[PDB]
Amino acid sequence: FIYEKSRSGDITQGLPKVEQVLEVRSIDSISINLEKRIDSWNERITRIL
Amino acid sequence: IRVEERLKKIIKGREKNILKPKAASKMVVSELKE
């Protein structure tokens, strides 16, 4: 039998989450959104100006 | 682009015309776009 539960609030959620975001080992705080923006800027800098 | 390809390898004739005829960035900063 397999049941899906439904927790998954988020992996780490206390001191360890704060430690993870503060200690930027890989930029993955909100990089599902932030990394996209950063890469887009770094590729779009070359423009008319 | 093809002009750049032949200009890299020293000089081999090809004095056809002034194909580039361009300016260098015009020192312009337009805000919105284009």
Q: Please state, as a whole number, how many other Cβ atoms lie within 10 Å of the Cβ of residue A3.
A: 5
Contact of A31 with A23, CB cutoff 8 Å: no
- With an 8 Å Cβ cutoff, is B19 touching chain A? no
* Residue A35, token pair as written in the block: 């990394």
The whole-angstrom separation of Cα A49 and Cα B30 is: 6
How many CB contacts within 8 angstroms connect chain A with chain B? 7
Single-letter amino acid code for the residue at B12: K
* Residue A21, token pair as written in the block: 């975001």
CA angle in degrees (0–180, nearest 5) for A46-A48-B5 = 65
